[PDB]
Design a protein around this motif. Structure first.
Motif, short mmCIF file in Angstrom:
data_model
loop_
_atom_site.label_atom_id
_atom_site.label_comp_id
_atom_site.label_asym_id
_atom_site.label_seq_id
_atom_site.Cartn_x
_atom_site.Cartn_y
_atom_site.Cartn_z
N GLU A 10 0.86 -1.22 0.00
CA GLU A 10 0.00 0.00 0.00
C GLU A 10 0.89 1.24 0.00
OE1 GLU A 10 -3.40 -0.22 2.91
OE2 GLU A 10 -3.19 -2.38 2.55
N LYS A 11 1.91 1.29 0.86
CA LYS A 11 2.82 2.47 1.01
C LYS A 11 3.53 2.76 -0.31
CE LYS A 11 6.30 4.85 3.70
NZ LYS A 11 7.60 4.81 3.00
N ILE A 12 3.97 1.73 -1.04
CA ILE A 12 4.79 1.91 -2.27
C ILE A 12 3.87 2.38 -3.41
CG2 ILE A 12 6.38 0.82 -3.91
CD1 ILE A 12 6.83 -1.33 -1.58
N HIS A 16 3.97 6.23 -6.04
CA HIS A 16 3.97 6.11 -7.53
C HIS A 16 2.52 5.97 -8.03
CE1 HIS A 16 8.35 5.76 -7.23
NE2 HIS A 16 8.13 4.91 -6.22
N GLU A 17 1.60 6.75 -7.46
CA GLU A 17 0.13 6.73 -7.75
C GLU A 17 -0.12 7.09 -9.22
OE1 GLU A 17 -3.55 5.66 -6.89
OE2 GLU A 17 -2.38 6.02 -5.07
N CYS A 163 10.33 -2.22 5.63
CA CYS A 163 11.34 -3.32 5.45
C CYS A 163 11.07 -4.10 4.15
CB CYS A 163 11.38 -4.22 6.69
SG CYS A 163 11.64 -3.29 8.23
N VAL A 164 11.57 -3.55 3.04
CA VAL A 164 11.35 -4.04 1.64
C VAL A 164 12.70 -4.33 0.98
CG1 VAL A 164 10.72 -3.18 -0.68
CG2 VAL A 164 9.09 -2.99 1.23
N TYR A 165 12.82 -5.48 0.32
CA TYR A 165 14.08 -5.89 -0.36
C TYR A 165 14.13 -5.25 -1.75
CZ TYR A 165 15.07 -9.07 3.51
OH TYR A 165 15.37 -9.57 4.74
N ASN A 166 15.35 -4.93 -2.21
CA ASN A 166 15.68 -4.51 -3.60
C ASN A 166 16.67 -5.51 -4.20
OD1 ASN A 166 14.54 -2.34 -2.18
ND2 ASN A 166 15.53 -0.82 -3.49
N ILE A 287 6.85 -5.26 -8.00
CA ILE A 287 6.70 -5.42 -6.53
C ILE A 287 6.11 -6.81 -6.32
CG2 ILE A 287 5.53 -4.60 -4.45
CD1 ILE A 287 7.92 -2.83 -5.63
N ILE A 288 6.95 -7.73 -5.87
CA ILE A 288 6.65 -9.19 -5.80
C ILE A 288 6.89 -9.64 -4.36
CG2 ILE A 288 7.00 -9.71 -8.22
CD1 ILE A 288 9.99 -10.45 -7.39
#
Ligand code: JOV
Ligand code: ZN
Ligand code: ZN
Length: 582
Positions: A10-12, A16-17, A163-166, A287-288
């Motif tokens: 939701e935040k991401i 980028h809406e 806490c999101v991985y790249n 986003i997976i």
């Protein structure tokens, strides 16, 4: 599912809406896909000119030159759930192993203070560039720590926002520095307090150093038993099951208070549920999510890989010894048999192994181990470059066993004392030292990186004729007082301006527990090489016309590099070698 990862998703979405779209041509089968958004960006390997100018004969060796030029269809695979007997074997073994590792250690939180000191001395903590430029800046700014605080209080609540991985047979999962701090606070103790030291874990080699690993393999070889097995797993990180992640999380059973909840939230919210952002050229950001596989900081990854590999190899040893009959189902009395094996011989069986993350060497009680494959295959730890049910090929000689990309030679000094030395194909060593990572390197910084490689060679690879000569040439070509550097920092005793003969004596003689006679060595000429034929087998150019001309004219090469760096204070180290000594 989405109740744990949704907030993050939701935040991401909102940042980028203008660009959010459920793309229908998404290439993911085994990853849960969520949406895409607009980006546009990518870091190739650059040549170290100081090392290349001083290794001219290798300019025509393709194995060296090709190293400087230049599977994500293994990350998009799935691992079947183990059978019930396998799950029982893993849970009993994991419970027992955390208790052994915990007998002489106390879990504890790592501190903002400890984290701050790590960032201010350059450790590859796998963070991203935004708000502050570097990590050094974020750490001094109190605004950052309020971000950390918000996330931290969110974790105590059992929730996650940032806490999101790249993503970027390798895959590195960068997070932002805040997520990395919270990981380090809860689980840094595993590395910081040496849970996988050999003294503490019996199988582990954490903190041991490349000058100890050969002595350790020779100590394993002294045990009565079968061949030495060194099976590599095909893509270990991709074969970590959700059952593996749940046995790893049982370290929290040994914690208390805040720490226990903070560590429980890392395992639940970031490890057993992941959100990742991947660059796709078709350029968007995907986003997976997925529940299983390894995706943590590389230092926590190392300790949990070591833990789960120790567990898996003890179970393979149980299978060969006939402790259990089938993985389909453990009987009530097979459970007591497994428990009793661990209590009775578990520590002996750990001492039969050398384990460094996904890398192992095992000397089992006998060669039944070779064909004991049911638990290993059913845990999903499938062997590389052999057919699923084909028995493992063992090694009869500890000096032939591969470990941590090396093999090890027994080398007898003229005075009879015994060195066990690390070795690998010399093309690999020269080709790596010719490469730098990143931009904006000054000539002085390039020179200081060349000096770090040169001093590593003098300490680890002194027994290779070409590397002792090239190390002496580089140390002669770089100003004597310039300090060796690295951008991604095993124990690194070559990172020093102390005299390399003094460091050699401390490492190989004074502090070496396998060396009874502590008589210091007075010169490099007392320090031996491999046999001439063994040096050639391991990639030496001794005997070639190119190499003879290079060695004879080495002062001309040294002077070419001194002329580029300019009028500085240099030392000639070449007369430390018998044939440049008049
Ligand atoms: C280590 C020294 C300097 C002294 O023995 N050189 C060699 O061992 C060497 C060099 C070139 C060719 C071959 Cl056959 C041996
Ligand atoms: Zn979080
Ligand atoms: Zn060798």
């Amino acid at each position: 599912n989405l109740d744990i990862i949704g907030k993050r998703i939701e935040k991401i979405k909102q940042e980028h809406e203008t660009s959010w779209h459920y793309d229908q041509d998404h290439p993911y089968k085994t990853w849960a896909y969520h949406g895409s958004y607009e980006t546009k960006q990518t870091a190739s390997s650059m040549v170290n000119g100081v090392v290349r100018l001083l290794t001219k004969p290798w300019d025509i060796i393709p194995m060296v030159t090709q190293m400087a030029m230049t599977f994500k269809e293994k990350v998009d695979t799935r691992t079947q759930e183990p059978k019930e007997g396998t799950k029982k074997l893993m849970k009993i073994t994991a419970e027992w192993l955390w208790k052994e590792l915990g007998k002489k250690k106390t879990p504890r939180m790592c501190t903002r203070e400890e984290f701050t000191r790590k960032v201010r001395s350059n450790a590859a903590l796998g963070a991203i560039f935004n708000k502050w430029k570097s990590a050094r800046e974020a750490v001094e700014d109190s605004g950052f720590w309020e971000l950390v605080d918000k996330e931290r209080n969110l974790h105590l609540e059992g929730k996650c926002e940032t806490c999101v991985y790249n993503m970027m047979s390798r895959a590195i999962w960068y997070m932002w520095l805040g997520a990395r701090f919270l990981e380090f606070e809860a689980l840094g103790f595993l590395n910081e307090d040496h849970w996988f030291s050999r003294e503490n874990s019996l199988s582990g080699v954490e903190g041991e150093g490349l000058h100890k690993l050969g002595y350790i393999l020779r100590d394993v070889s002294k045990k009565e038993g079968g061949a030495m097995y060194a099976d590599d797993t095909a893509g270990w990180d991709t074969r970590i099951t959700l059952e593996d992640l749940k046995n790893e999380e049982m370290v929290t059973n040994h914690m208390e208070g805040e720490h226990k909840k903070l560590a429980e939230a890392i395992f639940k919210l970031t490890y057993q549920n992941k959100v990742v952002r991947v660059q796709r050229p078709t350029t968007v950001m995907d986003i997976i999510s997925r529940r299983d596989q390894r995706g943590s900081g590389q230092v926590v990854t190392y300790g949990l890989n070591t833990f789960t590999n120790m567990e898996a190899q003890l179970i393979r040893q149980m299978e060969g010894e006939g402790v259990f009959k089938s993985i389909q189902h453990l009987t009530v009395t097979e459970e007591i048999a497994v428990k009793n094996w661990l209590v009775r011989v578990g520590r002996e069986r750990l001492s039969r192994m050398a384990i460094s993350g996904d890398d192992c060497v095992v000397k089992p009680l006998d060669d039944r181990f070779a064909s004991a494959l049911t638990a290993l295959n059913d845990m999903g730890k499938v062997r590389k470059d052999i057919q699923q049910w084909e028995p493992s090929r063992g090694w009869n000689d500890w000096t032939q066993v591969p470990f941590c990309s090396h093999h090890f030679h027994e080398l007898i000094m003229k005075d009879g004392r015994v060195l066990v030395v690390p070795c690998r194909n010399q093309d690999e060593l020269i080709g790596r030292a010719r490469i730098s990572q990143g931009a904006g390197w000054s000539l002085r910084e390039t020179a200081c990186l060349g000096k770090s490689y040169a001093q590593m060679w003098s300490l680890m690879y002194f027994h290779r004729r070409d590397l002792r000569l090239a190390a002496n040439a580089i140390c002669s070509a770089v100003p004597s007082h310039w300090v060796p550097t690295s951008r991604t920092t095993a124990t690194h005793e070559w990172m020093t301006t102390e005299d390399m003969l003094t460091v050699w004596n401390r490492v190989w003689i004074q502090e070496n527990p396998w060396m009874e006679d502590k008589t210091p060595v007075e010169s490099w000429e007392e320090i031996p090489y491999l046999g001439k034929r063994e040096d050639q087998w391991c990639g030496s150019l001794i005997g070639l016309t190119s190499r003879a001309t290079w060695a004879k004219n080495i002062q001309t090469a040294i002077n070419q590099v001194r002329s580029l760096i300019g009028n500085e204070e240099y030392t000639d180290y070449m007369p430390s070698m018998k044939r440049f000594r008049r």
